Each structure stands twice: as C-alpha cells, then as structure tokens.
Tab-separated table of C-alpha atoms and ligand atoms in Angstrom:
chain	number	residue	atom	x	y	z
A	1	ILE	CA	81.410	89.304	90.575
A	2	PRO	CA	78.659	91.705	90.994
A	3	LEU	CA	77.763	92.634	94.561
A	4	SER	CA	74.722	91.553	96.072
A	5	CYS	CA	72.919	91.701	99.764
A	6	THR	CA	73.318	89.760	102.752
A	7	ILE	CA	69.820	87.832	102.284
A	8	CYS	CA	69.888	88.007	98.808
A	9	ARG	CA	73.205	85.880	98.460
A	10	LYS	CA	71.604	82.898	100.920
A	11	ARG	CA	68.445	82.435	99.083
A	12	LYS	CA	70.425	82.910	96.018
A	13	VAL	CA	67.727	85.154	94.351
A	14	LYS	CA	68.754	88.198	92.154
A	15	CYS	CA	70.077	91.280	93.996
A	16	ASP	CA	68.798	94.682	92.510
A	17	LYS	CA	70.617	97.615	94.388
A	18	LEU	CA	67.600	99.559	94.767
A	19	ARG	CA	68.062	102.362	96.829
A	20	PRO	CA	67.289	102.220	99.544
A	21	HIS	CA	66.363	98.433	100.189
A	22	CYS	CA	65.824	96.147	97.301
A	23	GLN	CA	62.938	94.475	95.304
A	24	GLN	CA	63.501	91.306	97.310
A	25	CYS	CA	63.815	92.841	100.849
A	26	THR	CA	60.675	95.078	100.388
A	27	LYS	CA	58.590	91.927	99.346
A	28	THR	CA	59.778	89.710	102.354
A	29	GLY	CA	60.344	92.966	104.766
A	30	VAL	CA	63.480	91.990	105.308
A	31	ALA	CA	64.761	95.523	104.456
A	32	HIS	CA	66.499	95.737	108.333
A	33	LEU	CA	68.639	92.939	106.840
A	34	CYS	CA	69.214	94.719	103.504
A	35	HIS	CA	73.000	95.912	103.306
A	36	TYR	CA	75.283	95.310	100.214
A	37	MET	CA	78.578	93.905	100.729
A	38	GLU	CA	80.948	96.707	101.155
A	39	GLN	CA	83.201	97.365	97.743
A	40	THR	CA	86.039	99.046	100.361
A	41	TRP	CA	87.222	95.948	101.822
B	1	ZN	ZN1	69.309	92.357	97.183
B	2	ZN	ZN1	68.628	93.481	99.551
C-alpha cells in the first residue's frame, strides 16, 4: 500500500506527499498534524 499521513488516513482523503505539508493539511490547517507514516518500520 502507499503511505498516507495521519489525519488524511482518518478522513480518508487522498494524501499527497507534498513536502513540507500536503494540500489537505494546508487547507484545513493541520500542517502540524502532517506527518507521513514511516517506512522504516
Ligand atoms: Zn496527507
Ligand atoms: Zn498531510
């Protein structure tokens, strides 16, 4: 599966992976909660 950030998976909107914060989190203003799930684990 692809990654998705922690709020984007909860609303179930398409995560974007724009650095720094997504198009979602810019617009709602949850850029603070914008972190993509790590691929190391
Ligand atoms: Zn996202
Ligand atoms: Zn995000």
